[model samples]
Target: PPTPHLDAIERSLRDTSPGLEGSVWQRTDGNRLDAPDGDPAGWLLQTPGCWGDAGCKDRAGTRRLLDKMTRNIADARHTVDISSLAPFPNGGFEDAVVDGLKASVAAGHSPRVRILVGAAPIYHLNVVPSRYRDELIGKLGAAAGKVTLNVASMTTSKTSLSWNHSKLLVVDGKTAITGGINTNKDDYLDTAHPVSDVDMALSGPAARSAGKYLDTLWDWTCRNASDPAKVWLATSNGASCMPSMEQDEAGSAPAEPTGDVPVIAVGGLGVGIKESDPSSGYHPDLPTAPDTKCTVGLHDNTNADRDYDTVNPEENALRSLIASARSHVEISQQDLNATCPPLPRYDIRTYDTLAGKLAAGVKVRIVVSDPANRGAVGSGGRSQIKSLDEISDTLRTRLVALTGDNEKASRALCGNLQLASFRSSDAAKWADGKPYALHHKLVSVDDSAFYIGSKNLYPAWLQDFGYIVESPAAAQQLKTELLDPEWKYSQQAAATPAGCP
Candidate 1:
């Protein structure tokens, strides 16, 4: 028999129902949300302030996030559980925040801090720098009794590629901060070299749900620990720094709805992950908010295999969203390549989907990272923008050829597709400057719904996660605050393509 909590999580994943209201949702203007309530969910545009502008607007979001993290650490009473692809010391958390943690230990509150580090990018032997990791361990030296650090290498079950690409923070099982934002000085404080990112501050049942997932991850890391020596134990008077095996079987129950706001937590259980239920490992089902006039769902692409082929839930969810767009479809991604063929795992079919919409007269606008931001002419040395240009050229050619001298009509048909690339102000500077990349993967449809996740429009089987929010307010806020500005910025001479304008 399944436990109630486990069953609830499963139901929320697969079930569709009318969503309730009253859960306040606020979108951040660029990078900052002023006094966002308990359950604020949106993207994190982690752009730093402009060069020499002490009151630069770009840094607002980053500053707000740092402030929240600092405050949360100081206010944590019992436990602070955090997970990230990049966490702490690589400039993610500054010395002031690290010192606040030191003060927490000295305050003798006996609070526990559990940090799970995703050390997947092996190029850097230490994802959490050994210097910082050791410094944290040393800072909590005897207080190591209270702080537990577990570094887990995320990899595919069948390959050497790393896939542990989740960013989240849970405080006292009541609040969570998650999204694409990574922790690093460049991500938060740097003005010129700011990394573009986003995050959400969630509270209530959503936080509890995220907390349960974190617990499962902690256990998973403990089970797979290569160096038993690395797993530390707490002293007699302190909490256990190591993960408890017994908790794995207990399973995380679905948290009761804490407020009127209807929210569901969704994502893929990592490859071969089993929490309590051994029969079903990491199901990728999405919740359906059928009650609301607007639809909301959470989807993910994880651990793809030949059995499922490319019909992953996340891809399907996005396709459904695009297909549903009646008037317009707007999208932004770190990389957007229309010509790349779809791989079996991460088959978004984004290019084809947008083309179909374009054929049907739906306006399509896409925003991608400025090529220079990738430290090369193109992202990963491949010109996704150039590919997009080719795609646009083909579309225009087809329209002109079919319309036969009807220049106005062909132009109208071809004009429906607009492509642009966005870069932070200092995105092109090389010497003594870090070029910030546009790292958001988002889609807003008809000004009603939006999808935010890790799945880019490329063909690869990388396990990733994200959510589909039905809140029009949230979707529109993204349009006005982040998406529109990026599209406008891309129109500038430095970013726009010749003759393409």
Candidate 2:
């Protein structure tokens, strides 16, 4: 059981959700960190960073988003990051906005930048030019060595990294901006195939929560980490970071729990799953002991981001979960491919199948980001928001079929006991950025337990699995916040088209 604070939150929701309607918004960001010096420089990085062909086909949208973000980065005092990939010369897409990020960093806009990337070469969308990656890394290293700037790779074994491999940037330890968004131009610009996604930049407790997560990663990167314990230490970071300082208003460290099973989140990550590296066999670390008391599991997708994948393991996890779903299951991911068999050949297929389970009666909810698809390139060469419209139709058609008057009769679930909602959030609008939300994969059942990790519900994401940090903490916190202010949907809206109460 949670503390009185969490218990009170649950009671309030179960007893008075309607009366507490207006109070929900405060829950989402009420505990967010605050900037003592509202100076834009004191501002934390609170925006999602996504790049790729999803919606970058349109040059103008891409340019606008990039220019604005660059301005933000320039205004910041210091910036630190882990792996980041973006559009640059030689990247099929011709976007010059990337130069702005590199230029600002080099010019000392952000005095310090540290990037810890996997030594293993992976195929980041051909957006970043080969020359640029080297330069970015070199400059970051040079900056760190010269003044306060630093960009260096971790000393871990070259074989793999954990799911925390995603991008992140925190300013002065006060604010943090993170999510699937990478520091790439294509992520912002509209592409022939506009991408749909989310990221978040939050301050207050959330920022600190995120910052603490970063610290966990940094700890994993520190010297002296050699065995399974060290690698698992990284896993603990992922588990521990999500609910860090949940109600700690002062950011002061709290006393460790004294009870057995007192919300013990699973920790200790092993080297990530590897695909076919023919010459080099997979050198996997040991798995952490599973905490079966945990009933829910969550993760974001990163399979599409791997190098050369042979056996997609992330997919297996999905299949395993589906096969193992006992009473109920729930899920949400950005894309869902309606085509394909029970399981689509693509990553989006996972959600498609999960929907089938919901139709059968296993409660499931999938919240997808609207496709930011766009039209062709202009004379200056860019696309428009055409894909966005297509996404609307696709989402409707997909959801209707999943939960029509007739439901699937295969599993314990009745006609897809699921509800699908299409939603969007951004920093300027919501709490994160223009495109708010990213890289969050989660699963819950009956509020008793849950799972959180980096894997998405996609078949490909599962197969080409990235590092995943599954934990009970994610499930516990999700349960506590469903009726609290931290729940995104429950929170107040900041701009046009506000969220439901």
Candidate 3:
């Protein structure tokens, strides 16, 4: 049953609230990673790099965002702070960019430049190489002297399991960029089949909240100087750097409301879901600020010291958003596994919730990567595929039971509770290879609100973050730019029992 809390969020979506006035969200589609030459200052999409006969490069429309970021870095004066899982040079942020910053700092123009980078944990052992650390440090050049380099990660003992995995880039605390994309050339290049990704560029007072969140991470990591397990400071002289417990209190100020969009930042700490614990009591912890305009949800797994049984504001917010949808729920994800890996079956509450919506006669549409695109194999792969099929199966089953006849069920399920997967043809192949998986985690509900973030449907033990914009314009733009294309081109893999067209 729906609760009062869920009702309130739903009302917020339905009611007329202050939002990104006149400057409603605009859709900038980069057909191939070549983003347009405009001020890429808003929501942007980045699919996996499609390598073709020409060679590796960012997929269409993806490079524009990076270009804007690099341009911001080159043009910033007050401060430039970055928090990310990988901070190596990628896209347009190379040695030349660092050199430009150094020149600016040398001339006493660029005052503060700090970067908080987290090394990947064991699960991603083979994903990122060890050389990234030294390489990034080496490339900082003379800018290293002016910029502060901070390294954050789990302890060596826990290194095999967990690590920091938040990605963000803020310039002068005036504009910021956050999303699933990493700072590696391969992530942007088409050589090794880049992972599809999405990111947003906030160009207003909203960035202040993102900047503060990064500060909180810096403060938490640098809480202890003796403990190399949590955080450490890097030196510019190419020598072993030391960790500092002291927090830098320089250049801190409140960001005056200066832009059109309204945004609030929310964060979640600790590990997996649990009811309660002795150390931490149970409570419905939903983080929010005074302004009820836009909401930013952040999930961090680095708070391992705390009990994992506390309420996760980020996940709860997501559930509330999904449940609040009155007319339709359109979703896109890379993977929508029902259970943890190796487990054949388990209750995926997320799926159950969506199914409940369909039972209520709400239209539901989902877009996921085709199994063939990722080369899934073994029981693990089969389980994932089986889970997705089960979701569709469950929806169909519920529809039939509710409607009473095959004909009515077919009508309701045809394009309403649609499940489509992206399949690339020969023309989709690039210099490197065929178009990769659809890596976007997006949701638009009834043109009321939408969510864009790093968290996949599967509740994995990882830190993730995204934003929930309560703007009809934003939702409408996403539908036209992303959902329409996926829905129109996605191929139906098999014949449906309901005879869906």
Candidate 4:
């Protein structure tokens, strides 16, 4: 017999899906709704905001998803809500906002529909429009009686705006979706190449919990729209409309979605994880630490103090974990470049500390993007391996050590560290030349806990928007799916498998 919560996620994964065979549903319909056809597609993009990476591509993909939604916003029968953290007219996402507003206005629904955006990108803005100084206010004014636009532009002086990491959509208060897909078509359609990604649509209690989170973000954004004094006054419009900030302080019942059991899981740094049973909508601390075998870390919500001296509670939590990394450490991030120095990201520091552990013979493995690095205005980035040839040479050298055949070489390298690269060739099959993707940002330690989220191994990223998750089941899976070539090949792990209905 299985616990109800575990069974729910399992069933959604392997059974009772719409069109999907077995647990895999097409996601559009037929008991399982496939992408595009499903309500509030369970796709959220998490790409490197830097050049030639997922972020660039996601910008394009997000545009397409938003565009599709725009086409439907006009029907009076249609209800919609949207959230964004990018500044208006900043980069390509502006088009998404412009188009979204047009559709919502045309739909003609009052109050029931809402749009919330947070974390305005200010470092890279080129004055005026980038400042979001007025675009949001203007949009709200234009459709004064027809629509609502709220924003929260926080101080990201030390955050990683490189990735617009969180991608979630809730539809009609009944369905919830989340994943590493951006609004850009580049990511969703994979125009650049066959990019690999996954998103999940959750219902039951989990769906309700997701709804509360989305609502919280919305309220926070709305409350932070202006100076505290002005926003407070604005909340007075309707006695029933509890101010976003006030409701949080008042200990009100969570605005959880209906018709499902509740499930809660903490996202971001720290061991503070809790889930609510959908049946009761009551949250309880997890019975034990989450299985971190896969990975976990702070990927987004970079509302931390940058000046190390400020001492972020979240950073303190993360550092506690980082300091405890025992044996074998593995990392795979497109931009392994770090902000501080000669090492790949600040990850070398992780290895440096592990040196003491390695002396007792702890094995460490590291993989960084051979391509290049990118970041926010001050994102510290540098390639550990500069070129493709360098990538190949590096791998050959590491393989030489794995065999323990090159003792001399092993001695030359400090620490019990093992390094390798998953080149472009490794991303695809040689037979048909189909490209395989290693678009994961994660690391695992001794089959125990691991850290996986939006942040790369780089130092600046530590200061940016990121999350580090700790899941044992997830970490174990990554070792096979992301690390071992034999397993990756034998299991055909890169592709989503089809199953019997």
lDDT of all predictions, in order shown?
0.48, 0.33, 0.49, 0.35
TM-score-wise, the better of 1 and 4 is 1
- What are the clash counts of all predictions, listed in order? 14, 94, 17, 87
**TM-score of model 3 vs. true structure:** 0.70
Q: What TM-score would each prediction reach against the true structure? A: 0.68, 0.41, 0.70, 0.46
TM-score attained by model 1: 0.68
Model 3 clash count equals: 17
Error of 3 at 284 (Å): 7.3
Order of candidates by TM-score, top first?
3, 1, 4, 2
Distance from true location, Cα of 18 in model 4, Å: 44
lDDT of 4 at 465: 21
Error of 3 at 62 (Å): 3.2
Give the Å error, residue 375, model 2. 21
lDDT tens digits, residue span 382-466, model 1: 2344434544544444344444444543444456766766544423442345434566767777776666655555433334445
Best by lDDT: 3
| Per-residue lDDT of model 3, residues 1-501, tens digit only | 213333444343222111211111111111111123562323555444232222434355555555656666776665666655544445455543465466556656633555555543333322222354455546766555665444434322242232345566766656666766666665555345555566766655555555555564555455543576444454334433322211132244544554334343333332421222333333323222111211213232212222332323444445666787789998777666523222212223355557567767788877666555544331111124433565566555555555677666566666567776543322343345554456666777787666666555544443445556665555566666666655655643422433665
Which 10-residue window in model 3 sums to the lowest lDDT? 22-31
* Model 1: lDDT of residue 84: 55
